[model samples]
Every structure is written in C-alpha cells, then in structure tokens.
Target: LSVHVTDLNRDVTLRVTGEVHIGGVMLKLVEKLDVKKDWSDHALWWEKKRTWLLKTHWTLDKCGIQADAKLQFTPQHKLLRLQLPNMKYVKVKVNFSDRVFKAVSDICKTFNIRHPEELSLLKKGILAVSQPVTSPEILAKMFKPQALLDKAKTNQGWLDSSRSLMEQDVKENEALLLRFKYYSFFDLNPKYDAIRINQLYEQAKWALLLEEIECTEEEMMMFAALQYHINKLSIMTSENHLTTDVNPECLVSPRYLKKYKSKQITARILEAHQNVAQMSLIEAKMRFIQAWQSLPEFGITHFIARFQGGKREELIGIAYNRLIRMDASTGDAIKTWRFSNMKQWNVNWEIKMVTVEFADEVRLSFICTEVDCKVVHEFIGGYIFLSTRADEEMFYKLTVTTVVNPKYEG
Candidate 1:
C-alpha cells in the first residue's frame, strides 16, 4: 500500500506492507521526515480520527490503507502566553506564518470583542507593534505555559526568561513571526488610555504594598474574614474609604468574600491601602505588627539578637515570647541602631521593645526595665523601624523592636 504523509515541512510518499500497524507506519513516516523527536510527538493523520487510531490500534488493512491515503500533520500548538500592558495577558496560538498585525488583531478579537466598550479604544492606537519579537525586551514579557513552567523544575527545559522565538535562526519568517521579547504585552487594556481607570488600576496593581507583609495561613484567613466583615459593616456607615462613591469597589458588584480570598495577594494589598489608611498611627502600627506576628516565618520564640556594631546583644520578642535562644535569627531583629549620644544612656534599666508598625516598615516601642547591670551600665533607646514581609527563609523577622537604650559601652 502507498500513502502520503503531509507534514509542516512537506509531504512524503511511502510504500508499506498491509500487515503494518498504524503506529508502525507513523514511525516510518517519522524516520522519513527526520526532524526532532519532540516536534513530531503530535503528528497525526487529520483525516482519520486520532480517537479511533489509538483505541482500535488499527492495522493497514483495518484502516483500509490504499494508494493516496492522505495523512496531514500539524505541529503541536500550545497556547503561548503574551503579556499586555495592563497586568492582563492573552493566550495565543501562533504559527510561523503569524505576523505582528495578525497577532495584534487576534488579541483585539479575543479580549476587546468580549468587551465591546474597548472597540472605540482600538482607534486610539492601543494596538501596536511595541518591539521586535526576537529582542530580549519582548521575551522578558512572555509568561511560560504551565507545562513549560513544570518542565523547568528538574532543569529539563528552558524557562520563559530565556525562551526565544528563534528570530534570526528561523529564516525568512522573521517579519511574520510574533516577537516574544521586547513589548509590554500584559498591559494592553482599553482603559489604559483613560486617565481615571488607569489611575484606579495603578492603585490596585502597584500602589498597595501587599508583598511587604507576611502572615501564617491561619492568620491570613482570620485577617481576610475580619476585613470582609468590616467592609460589609461599613456599607451602612459609609466610613470605609474603600466604599466611598469614588472607590472602584463601591462601583463594582461586591466580590464574593471567599472568591476574593483566593487572590489575596492582590485583594489583601488593596485592603491594606484602603482600610489600613483609616487606622490611627498606633493602631495601624499595632495591626501591622499583630499580623506580622502571626507569620510562621518568624517562630514564636525569644532570640538573642547580635548586633553587627561591636557584637552587642539584644533580647527580641514576636507576638508572644518563648525566651530560650542562644543565637541571632535573621527575621528576629529589627533594625538596630548605635546610640550616638553617651550620657543620655540609662545604665540601671534595660531597654526592651514591643512590636509596632510604622508606615510600610515595622518598628519597636521601647520600654525601660530594671536589669541592674553590674557595671555602671548606660541605657540608650533609639528609633528602630522594620516589619515582617515574610518569606520561607525567614526574610522578615516577626517582631521588630526599636530601642535606643545602648549600642557601644566602655
């Protein structure tokens, strides 16, 4: 039996025995094409259903193989993520033949068509060829497919960071191929042209410092619940700035509390900016500290914090304290300061700090405790500010104490 296999490159004619299995025929076709093995993994006969071939394990005779049986193979097409300018992205499948204008049209068709309000914005030149597809600038904006990200785990495949669209190597298709490197693709939204919406999105996306705080999962749940309850209650009073006429949340339909919690990274940040803004300086500080204390990154134990300046030691506490520590932990110490003044030191009493939050940084409120230093010890309490933005490596210490009691003593 003779058959034609059409591939991305070209078609090939093959003469085979009727006894051969379809899978074996595929293998022979692969050998004739001589391309990378992975590129051909998805090669199939478009005419016959793959559902039938894999299940029935059809032989040449079973498939009624005969002259001029056409097998069409298209390259495996996965949705490649293209980032836009608006923290939004579009997943597009592009062949080598797809050009800049085509890809841009596809994006407009996908996102804008679904949002007809964006139709007018199209005339504003929102759709543009921002950069050369093959440039490093555009590739940086690309998001890796989940499978590609998974493959990056064991050093198996290239990460999106360095993945290329093979601009120079791909030959004549250079102008037609989508450049993955230079453009800011995710932010390509219709409202970027509108100043007010742009301002709101900016506040939501960038202004809130959500990434700067860390807490336990339990703590996060409690915090989120508390926030949701507060928001609901504030609707009556109209006190929450988050609920004001100008606020976006006030305009949009109320989000499901549970649904909102899932993307807490964004949701929490927005809350922090809106709700936390209403808190008193001390209350804000206390609330921030209280949340920081709940983070697993900063264990609930007292640690002997060693200061780099002359290796001075200070006792630090988080939410609660278990004082049995001999070494300094990274997240354990708030920013320590050396007392520039000398006679002002109070040698008789030890200065300790309780956790507080100040602006974006966590700080400590100092307390004087009588320690009875054997030497005519001096104590100086100074301003210390820091906060826990938790990480697995204990990046932010749970408790930040700022005391200016002492630094270097003779």
Candidate 2:
C-alpha cells in the first residue's frame, strides 16, 4: 500500500510494507523528506479519518492504513496567542498534549510574573447574541432577566490547568487570556518581575481613577504624582535623556485636572513628583504599588450581598487570605474570616447563597444580591488555591524589607 503525506511544507508518496509499525514508517518519511531529526516533535495525522495516529506501536494493518491514504505530517507543538490584561497579546509554543499548567508557566516566565499561583489561562466567553445592536441600552432591554442569567452561567470560561490542552478543546493558534485569578500584589518582586509589577500598578491606577477602588483626595494626589514619576522615568530612558520639568496635565486624570486648576494642588503633586525624581523607574513603580496596596480595596473582589435574612445590603469582599464583610457605603470591613481559620464553605446556586463555617464552629451565610452566587464561590475557591500553592520563600523575600539604622538612636 502507498500513502501520501505532507507536513504542510512539502509532499511525498511512499510505498509501505505489510503490517509495519507506524513508527518505522515515520522514520523513513523523515529520511525521505529531510525534515528535522526530532521524530517526537512530529506526528502522523490520518486526514481522511480526521484523527491523529497517536499509537506508534500499532501496526499499519491494525491501525486501518489503506492504499493511497492521505496523511498529514504535522508538528506536535502548537503556537498559541495569549491575551494579556494590558490589552496586549503574546505568542507561545507548547506541545499539543501538554497540560494547561505548562502554558500558564511559560507565559509567567515570558512576562516575568513572580506569582504564578495567582494566574490562570482563560478562554474568552462567547456572546449569547451575535447580532449588531444600535446601543448597549437596546441590547439590555432586548434580553430578558432569565436570558441574562443563563448567559452569565455559560460565560464562566476559566480553563482547568490539570487537563491536557487537547482534552480542554484548545487547538492550534487558539487565543487564550492570562488573567490574575487571585489578586495578590504583596509578593510582586521589583527585581525579577518588574514587568508584572508595572502591569499591576497600571491596573490599580485605573481602578482608583474609575472609583472602583475608593481612596482619599490626598491618596489620589500621591498616586497621581507617583504615576507621573514612573511615566517621566520611562520617557527618559526611551528618549535617552533626563528632564526635570514635570507636566502638570499628565499628573492627574481629566476629571481631577479640572478640580486641580488651583496652583496649590498642582504644586503639591509636582512637589511629590520631585521627591521621587531621583529613584529608578522600577523604584517608582514599586512605590506606586506599595501605596496602592495600603488601600483596603486593593486586592479584594467586592460583591453586594446580605445576611441571610437581612433587608440592608452589605459589601462582601474576597481577598487572598480572607473573606470580609464590609460596610456597603464606606467600604470598611465590619468582619473578616481568614481562610486559614475557615473549616468549610459552599455555594447554594439555586438559592444564590454562600455559607461558611469557621474552625470555632461559627457559621455565616450571605444571600448574593448583585452578583452571581457562583462568582463569589469561585473567588473564594481561587484564593484558597492560591493560598495553598504560593511559594513561601518568594513571598517572604519580596515582602520583607530591612531598614538599616546608621546610628543606634536610643
């Protein structure tokens, strides 16, 4: 029997002997095609059957290889496009049979992400309605509450890293997102993961600007000055020159620019910027992150919920280490339950409630109001996963800073 094969680069037809192993046939094909000698990187695909011949130990007759069969000689590795949070994409190569964790690790290495445990590979969710709409208002009005609810349930697309890429239906050239499944900036290292730290800083800056994270006016000005310092340093390096003058317009958001028209606010921000002018770009970035981390809302995912029988709504936040019940208006924590102290937690999807039990046998339950119950459940589980798997050495090294005293000031 004769078989025709193409690596999508070249084509060849070869005669096969009776009942030979597919591995031997692959060896001869590589010799004839003069392809790379790494046979493990190549695979035989039966195009007619639309399946890969994964079992090389099986003989051709047993594997159903017939005369004049069309086969594809393809690379076992696939190039994947990974979408980043900063609205950018990165291309990476991984084996088709590799687990999703392999891709996650590769992306973390490429981006110098210090906390790999906090990251996950996510597939973009498909929209329920594909038709073009005049406006978001129209679409909102068109979809019933049930339709929206069902859509939300279908859109939970985080991939399980324990499974192989093929098993998860991830294909060649697939575009997936690298997302921070558990937000924890305390372990971000300035020396090793400057790139990741900068991205987190940018995200936090926008969150503060958008009012997703609440902060005082003084805190806002401080953040704005730090942002200017980081930007000015970046420009200095890119332009290969240093300039002392700070642009007041670039210091604050447009909304705050109007509020800061008075010279007093402008001078305050500029003064703050001058104080950090001597620091390196990474130093400025880390300072900005450190300031942001001080905020209560920094690493918390908030959801509007209520006590099981309460009438008033409460802000429930899930953080890396604990669950917090916050004042809905002030965003201040009223109570906190550390994961280390929690004995069990569960979500009743039908009732839209989350229940938690503590080591001391204290139990609490919340009825999710504005968010899906499963979302709260997922955040709790994700943080637990992060807490359990995080690298202790790295965390300790990044978070602990020693200050040397020039003189023993007693």
Candidate 3:
C-alpha cells in the first residue's frame, strides 16, 4: 500500500509491504524525509479520523492505513508557559491533543494545590466583546445543546476543558495565567496558601485601579488606603522610609472627584493608612482582602441588563451563590435571589432571555443589553458549580439531570 504523509511542512509518499509494523514505517519515513529527530518524538495522525497512531507494535493493516491515505507526522507534545500566582512562569509539557482539564490537573499536582476545584486557566488576552446575537437560528448554531449548559459553568477568559488545546488556538510556548476563579473568602487565609492570597490581592487591586469593579467613593478611598498601607508596609520593612503619596485623582472618576477635593481625599487615605500603619505586610494584605470581601460587589460578575418590557437598565450581578439586581446608577441592590432559594434558571437562547424561577413560584425574565445571554447563563452555572464543589461527574449529573431528577435540584 502506498500512503501520502506530511510533517505539516513537507510531503512524501511511501510504499509499505504486508504486515509491517507502524514503528518501522515511521523510521523509514524519518530517514527518507531527512528529518533529524527521534521517531518517538513524532506520531502519525489520521486527520480524517482524528486518531493518532502511537502504538509502535501495531501493524499498518491493523491501524487502518490504506493506499492513498493522507496522514500527518506531528510532534507528540508541545511546551507551554504557565504564569503562576506568584508572578513566576513555569514550563509545562502537554500533548498536542490534551484537553485544558488535563493540563490544569497536572499543574495542580505540581503546585500541591489543596483546592484545585477553585482554579482555572485563563487565556492570556482580552476577552473579545462580540455583538449580541438577535437571531435564534444564529444563536442555536453558535453553541451545541450540551455546550449551552456547560458554557454557563465557567468565568470569562477560562479555557473550555472539553476542547483540545489546539482547538482553542493555544499556540506553542504561549502563556496562560493560573487564577483563583472562585472566591471562598475563607480560603484566602495566609496560613492556607500565601502565594494564592497575594495573587488574589494583586488581581483585586488591578480590578479596582481599572475601575472594572463598581464602588462608591467611600469604598474606593478605603481600598486605596489599604493598598497604600500594604505598599508602605513593604517599603518600611525593607528601607524604613515613607516616600509614597496617596493619589486618588487617577483612581477615582472625575465626577466623583468633583465631590471631594484632592487634598481632602489624600488626607482621608493617609488617616486610614495611619490607623493600619502598625500591621505587618501579611496582615495588611489579609486586611485588604477582608475589606474587599465585605463589599456587596465582591466576587460578583456584573452585567448591564433589563427586565423584559422595563424601561430602566439594571445592574445584574451573579455572585458565589446568589444573583442580584442593582440600581444601575447608584449601585444599590434592588433584589437578590439566593441559589439556595432558587428552583432553576434557564436561558432562552433563541430570544436571548434568561428566565429565573424561585422556590416561591416567582419567575422573572431579563435580557442582557451589554453582553450575550449565554454569558449570563454561564455565570450562574459557573457559580453554582463553585458553590457545590462539584466534580466533573457531579456537575454533569447536577446540571443535566436536575430538570428530570428532582433529587438534584437546589
């Protein structure tokens, strides 16, 4: 049988005799192609079948390699860079066809992560803000039935575990950030994981700095002061000097800045910092995270949405175990529905609406104006998964069977 093969760079055709081992054919290909690499480093791939021929002892006939068949000689594994919680990068080797969950498990094992379920691999890039789909047919075609439910199970920027890394457009040597996707507040203790706590603190600081998180001026000042204190603690421990200034001009929006002069803002931050001046670096970090955790928006993913036929836009947020609707302008809670009290929630992908049902038989439907309905669905699904600490098997059972099997509901 004559077969055509390419290393994805060059093409060649070779004839095989009866009962020849797949490994022998690979060796001959390497020699004929003039490739200077170990045969084991590459695998023969049948692209049409999405199968890799890795069993060296298997004969060509047994492996279904027939005449005129086209195959790819590809590398067995690709090396990727993972950015850790401590801001350090580590190289991890994964097979070209490995899923995101496999890589996450390997990383967790390497780091000795106590709660691996709380972690996620975030692709390094800004999440693309796509236009909302209005057509039911388009929306239906955009996601599969199972994916519709599963998509709601992850945060933004998280890689899909069921898909191969290559399918996600993950390039060789690309860097992916290891982030604590779920917030348990209790899990952020320094005694539990120092590295993870520090990483969470840094991410929270950036979210505040970029104004991604909504907060009142008073809350912002408190956060700024805590941040300043943390920085001051580090500086004082190392050099025993205080040279930094509390600058809220850049951190606060101009509208809010108009209410208070820069001098008074600085004084307020300095006073708050002075009160915490005695705390250690670790203590300051813990305090900062503790303060953030107290805020109503903490761990909440916000979306600009509105109730069906409503005129005013609302700030809808999904937290660890609840969903809330807030006054868009003032950031005050209008209503809240805890997951424990919720019966179920479903997304009408065709009309881009989310219908949430509660235990009291109260049902409400809303449409996300700024983002896709699927995203809102995913946040709710993801938070439920987090709160339940559900493994893959449990998650499938809980999500897929909850409708028909009342035992898994809530």
What tens-digit string does per-residue lDDT give for candidate 1 at 111-151? 43222111111100333211112454543444333221122
Q: After superposition, how far is residue 75 of candidate 2 from its true place, in Å?
A: 4.5
Better of 1 and 2 by lDDT: 2
Q: What is the alpha-carbon RMSD of candidate 2 to the true structure?
A: 13.6
> Candidate 2 at 202: error in angstroms?
3.0
TM-score of each: 0.23, 0.55, 0.60
Tell me the number of clashing residue pairs for each predicted model.
36, 0, 1
Task: Residues 1-410, candidate 3: write the lDDT tens digits.
Answer: 33344344667777768588988887788778665656567777666776666577998787876677887776757778877644457777777665555666666666655566566677641110111224656534533432212222333456665445665667778988887666764354545554545666766665565554557999899987887677656555434223556355675677868789877766565565554443466677788777777876677655667775668866676787677776666667778877776777766666667787777688777876423454455456656666654266543333311222132344
lDDT of model 2, residue 358: 71
Better of 1 and 3 by lDDT: 3
- Score each candidate by Cα lDDT: 0.33, 0.62, 0.62
**Ranking under lDDT, best-scoring first?**
2, 3, 1
Residue 275 local lDDT, model 3: 42
Residue pairs in clash, model 2: none
Off by over 4 Å in 2: 1-39, 42-76, 125-155, 206-221, 238-279, 302-317, 324-336, 344-356, 364-382, 388-410
Q: Cα deviation of 1 in candidate 1 (Å)?
A: 5.6
RMSD after CA superposition, every candidate: 24.5, 13.6, 13.8
